[PDB]
From a paper:
NMDARs function as heterotetramers composed of GluN1 subunits (with eight splice variants 1a-4a, 1b-4b) and GluN2A/2B/2C/2D and/or GluN3A/3B subunits. Each receptor subunit has a modular build with an amino-terminal domain (ATD), a ligand-binding domain (LBD), a transmembrane domain (TMD), and a carboxyl-terminal domain (CTD).
However, the electron density for the UBP791 ligand in this structure is fully continuous and substantially more ordered suggesting favorable binding of UBP791 to GluN1–GluN2A-4m LBD over GluN1–GluN2A LBD.
Numbering used by the authors:
A (entry chain B): 5 to 284
B (entry chain A): 3 to 98, 101 to 290
Write the structure that this text describes.
């Protein structure tokens, strides 16, 4: 039915957290919802199986509220072709690609609104503020993205060691804005956020440039509160996470009004306190 | 076709409003960074006392939102004429009777007196039902302005939450902040206090704090932090107790809406919005 929607998401704590289902009873309990993940049998076949999992987190709570207020049901699945979204040889992968190519009616998760994505999908109003921030060890003297240590790295001996996790909105922005910085940085590409935090804590990296909302959450949970974001939490290119819909979607209007009602009624601040607050 | 009718509102540092010179032109000035200030002629009422006739005259407008307007008009290649909202208000929907009407810039956009709102206009559910908002050109929130040396912890302070006539606080009439306090029943105690004291404009409330006639002013942090950076007798307290953004406003049938939003996103991403911050918002510090 037209009221039962295919929805794609991506694991990224604390926005989307994936757990195993109880083998018995094979049912999702507590604050979790069913979500499925296509898992390959092997690398010499296209055969796979949809493994039943359970999903929770900030964006899952938003989805549950939207489901109730906007009046839809959904079949939630985890993207397996890439991550948030990157255009490769003019073809979008990740959550963006699932929506563009009509495999999902919407994408719900830690999906950053930017200009190039907005050309191929519609975005809801932002429901979580984000941007580009810089994580360092407390006390590191870095003004921001425009710091000369980033812009002209080889003016320093030894040079500053900094990197990102490639293929998302952050790398796209640096590639477009700071060509020399970008080509320098790629030798410090990090395979994921957990690797980057280990490189910082152990002195292999001086700075980690990445999504503000994620970095703020990791800073709040850091053991010893040693890792911080620069500028009392400054953000370049402020934007937000948004729900991605197909261009011209008939769901956008009510989704937007619902999100704005949650914000205006204090419901969003509750989810922030539930999922995003940290000790530090 | 036709030139876009732009409506805006006085609200420093986003929109400055000054008299024209004797010859009808705007005096040449330079920003804090030495660049010429771009100014546009904006017509609007000089008299603003409630319940009086509105005499419109050409005036000079400039600031963060005017720079943004000029950028949008260059990018999308439209012409425009700017005017100041006749009733001086941002816009709320009020009961008359069982009918409801929009006032402020909201009312002008919906009636066709304007085609686009370019102003520090807060995106909220109430307005979004009626008009199209761009993605936010500025992320900010609400905070509280007080006279330096006034001690309150923020929105949960007992002098706000258990109020009396000894400590008066308020916001601007017919504004998004008025809507916010009226909507939430958990704020009803504060709303009933503020309703007795709300001001016709942000400038008047800020001056009232300076003059010890208003003890706290609840308003947009993008404005209040700017004032506190410029006037050392004023401070904010409690940091943001609620987050929101400003957006460009258009009718739902506007042919411009897609490209306005893409232009806003592009400007955040290429540093243009940060340039505007450095020019208009973040350059003093006490
Ligand atoms: O910031 C990145 O490069 C990747 C990323 C990280 C966290 C949330 N969103 C995204 C995204 O590209 O949408």
């Amino acid at each position: 039915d037209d009221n039962h929607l295919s929805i794609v998401t991506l694991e990224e704590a604390p926005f989307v957290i994936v757990e195993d289902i109880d083998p018995l009873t094979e049912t999702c309990v507590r604050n979790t919802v069913p979500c499925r993940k296509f898992v390959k049998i092997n690398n010499s076949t296209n055969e796979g199986m949809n493994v039943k999992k359970c999903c929770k987190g900030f964006c899952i709570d938003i989805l549950k509220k939207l489901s109730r207020t906007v009046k839809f049901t959904y079949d939630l699945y985890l993207v397996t072709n890439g991550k948030h979204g990157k255009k490769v040889n003019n073809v979008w992968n990740g959550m963006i690609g699932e929506v563009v190519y009509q495999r999902a009616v919407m994408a719900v998760g830690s999906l950053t609104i930017n200009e190039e994505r907005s050309e191929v999908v519609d975005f809801s109003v932002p429901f979580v503020e984000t941007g580009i921030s810089v994580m360092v060890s407390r006390g590191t003297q870095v003004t921001g993205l425009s710091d000369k240590k980033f812009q002209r790295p080889h003016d320093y001996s030894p040079p500053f060691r900094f990197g990102t996790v490639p293929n998302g909105s952050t790398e796209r922005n640096i590639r477009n804005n700071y060509p020399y910085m970008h080509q320098y940085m790629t030798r410090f590409n990090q395979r994921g956020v957990e690797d980057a935090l280990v490189s910082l804590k152990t002195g292999k990296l001086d700075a980690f440039i990445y999504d503000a909302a994620v970095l703020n959450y990791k800073a709040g949970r850091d053991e010893g509160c040693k890792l911080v974001t620069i500028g009392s939490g400054y953000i370049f290119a402020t934007t937000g996470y948004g729900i991605a819909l197909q261009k011209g979607s008939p769901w956008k209007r009510q989704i937007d009004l619902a999100l704005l009602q949650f914000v205006g009624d204090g419901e969003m601040e509750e989810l922030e306190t539930l999922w995003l607050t940290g000790i530090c | 076709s036709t030139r876009l009718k732009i409506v805006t509102i006085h609200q420093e540092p986003f929109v400055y409003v000054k008299p024209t010179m004797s010859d009808g032109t705007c005096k040449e000035e330079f920003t804090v960074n030495g660049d010429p200030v771009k100014k546009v002629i904006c017509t609007g009422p000089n008299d603003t006392s409630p319940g009086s006739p509105r005499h419109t005259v050409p005036q000079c407008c400039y600031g963060f939102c005017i720079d943004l307007l000029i950028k949008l008009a260059r990018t999308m290649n439209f012409t425009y004429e700017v005017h100041l909202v006749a009733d001086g208000k941002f816009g709320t929907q009020e009961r008359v009777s069982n009918k409801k009407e929009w006032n402020g810039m909201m009312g002008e956009l919906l009636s066709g007196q304007a085609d686009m709102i370019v102003a520090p206009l807060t995106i909220n559910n109430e307005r979004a039902q009626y008009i199209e908002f761009s993605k936010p050109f500025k992320y900010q929130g609400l905070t509280i302005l007080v006279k330096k040396g006034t001690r309150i912890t923020g929105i949960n302070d007992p002098r706000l939450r258990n109020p009396s006539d000894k400590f008066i606080y308020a916001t601007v009439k017919q504004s998004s902040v008025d809507i916010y306090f009226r909507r939430q029943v958990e704020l009803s105690t504060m709303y009933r206090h503020m309703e007795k004291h709300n001001y016709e404009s942000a400038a008047e409330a800020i001056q009232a704090v300076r003059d010890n006639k208003l003890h706290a002013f609840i308003w947009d942090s993008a404005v209040l932090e700017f004032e506190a950076s410029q006037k050392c007798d004023l401070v904010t307290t409690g940091e943001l107790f609620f987050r929101s953004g400003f957006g460009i406003g258009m009718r739902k049938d506007s042919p411009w809406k897609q490209n306005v939003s893409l232009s806003i996103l592009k400007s955040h991403e290429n540093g243009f919005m940060e340039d505007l911050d450095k020019t208009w918002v973040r350059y003093q510090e006490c």
